[PDB]
Amino acid sequence: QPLDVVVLLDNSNSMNNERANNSQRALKAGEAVEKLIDKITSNKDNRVALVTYASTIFDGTEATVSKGVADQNGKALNDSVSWDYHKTTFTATTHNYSYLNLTNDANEVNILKSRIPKEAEHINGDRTLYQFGATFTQKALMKANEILETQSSNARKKLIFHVTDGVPTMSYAINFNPYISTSYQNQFNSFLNKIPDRSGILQEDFIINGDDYQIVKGDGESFKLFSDRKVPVTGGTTQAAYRVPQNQLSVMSNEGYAINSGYIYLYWRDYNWVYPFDPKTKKVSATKQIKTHGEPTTLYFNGNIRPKGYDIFTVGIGVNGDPGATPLEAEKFMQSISSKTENYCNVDDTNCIYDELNKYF
Ligand SMILES: [Mg+2]
């Protein structure tokens, strides 16, 4: 049977070529993709598609994300020196780095390959698109799956080939119910009960029905969700604050910020917090706690992708855990969202990559 392949390409900010002491993540990821496309399409029956992602799918559409910190009541502000404090969402047109239709047309293949980026955003380049540079792996997996389920069939061979540094920093929320007495652990367990092997959670028990910027967890800050909700002063122990200027003082009060003579003490916005937590009292869960983006992503993978019975190969590029994970956490995560242990390969591990692909070619 012919092979339909979706390439998943991580174009998050962590992939910028300067990162990890010039590890050239994006350049190397783009080259690996070029090589995979050429290899797959050598057989004229096979189809390819490309899903490049970061905070969202980079397909040339407009997207919105939330940014900033918040006061003690969850009221949002941006404390950056380069943005107005009201700038707590950003809206922009993404690069079209995707080819979203499986194809074996040679001219279409050429379009796909022309759309392969070799660089990611820089904090000093496009500062607007830099805001769309989180690692929302879950969303990209959902798009790759949607493509295969929509456009392939049970009789064709299907592959997801995912190239990334392995550190997701955004995820969809697990739909815990704060209003029943069932403990969060028992709620989580009931979600697991729905998958034959209990290793995942179905899409229906994620919060998906809303625009991303209002429902998603994480903003690219970290692999981790934060147990301490207070923003600390850099390198320190003490909570940071936003001094409100004289000229600015009355407008901020009017707006409703918590100002204590005359400082707004800063908290991570609540989509960065360990959850679930009671939405009224803010009491964190005393049982099950989600503490990374890796876990909800793996659960989604295992609930909704792995059962489809096709192959998922993950290729690690310059792997160190940036931001907020260790190198091992990143590997384990990548292995967690591959068909099996040996379908995670470092890009440097050419033997691993040759061996897995050999079956098809
Ligand atoms: Mg990243």
Q: Structural domains in the chain? A: 1-67+88-229+269-361 (3.40.50.410), 68-87+230-268 (3.30.70.1830)
CA distances from 30 to 7, 46, 116, 243, 304 (A): 11, 20, 6, 44, 27
At 215, give phi and psi (nearest 5°). Answer: -125, -15
Cα distance between residue 110 and residue 37, in whole Å: 10
Cα distance between residue 89 and residue 76, in whole Å: 10
CA dihedral sign of residues 341, 8, 347, 358: positive
Cα distance between residue 41 and residue 37, in whole Å: 6
User: Token digits for 295?
Assistant: 């876990």
The answer for 263, left when phi > 0, alpha when psi is -120 to 50, beta otherwise, is beta
Consult the annotation and say whether 348 binds a ligand.
no
Core vs surface per residue 168-186: b (16+ CB within 10 A) or e: bbbbbbbebeeeeeeebee
- Whether the CB-CB separation of 169 and 12 falls below 8 Å is answered with yes
Consult the annotation and say whether 311 binds a ligand.
no
Q: How far is the CA of 17 from the centre of ligand 1 (A)?
A: 12
Cα distance between residue 223 and residue 116, in whole Å: 25
Q: How far is the CA of 137 from the centre of ligand 1 (A)?
A: 9
Q: How far is the CA of 30 from the centre of ligand 1 (A)?
A: 15
Consult the annotation and say whether 285 binds a ligand.
no
- How many other C-beta atoms are found inside a 10 Å radius of the C-beta of residue 40? 22
Q: How far is the CA of 47 from the centre of ligand 1 (A)?
A: 27
- Whether the CB-CB separation of 105 and 44 falls below 8 Å is answered with no
Which residue carries 């955004």 as its tokens?
170
Q: How far is the CA of 12 from the centre of ligand 1 (A)?
A: 4
Cα distance between residue 85 and residue 177, in whole Å: 33
Q: How far is the CA of 130 from the centre of ligand 1 (A)?
A: 11
Residue 95 identity (one-letter amino acid): H
Q: How far is the CA of 54 from the centre of ligand 1 (A)?
A: 7
Scanning 152-183, the segments in alpha helix (DSSP H) are none
Cis peptide before 307 (omega within 30 of 0): no
Sequence-distant (6+) residues with CB within 8 A of 263 are: 241, 242, 243, 244
246: DSSP letter: T
Chain-centre distance of CA 313, in angstroms?
A: 17
Cα distance between residue 252 and residue 131, in whole Å: 25
Sequence-distant (6+) residues with CB within 8 A of 82 are: 127
Consult the annotation and say whether 278 binds a ligand.
no
Residue 291 identity (one-letter amino acid): K
Q: How far is the CA of 121 from the centre of ligand 1 (A)?
A: 11
Consult the annotation and say whether 153 binds a ligand.
no
Cα distance between residue 272 and residue 270, in whole Å: 5
Cα distance between residue 281 and residue 260, in whole Å: 22
Q: How far is the CA of 133 from the centre of ligand 1 (A)?
A: 7
Q: How far is the CA of 159 from the centre of ligand 1 (A)?
A: 22
**Total residues belonging to the chain:** 361
User: Token digits for 73?
Assistant: 């009541």
HSE of 108, CA atoms in CB hemisphere, 13 A: 14
Q: How far is the CA of 63 from the centre of ligand 1 (A)?
A: 18
Determination technique used: X-ray
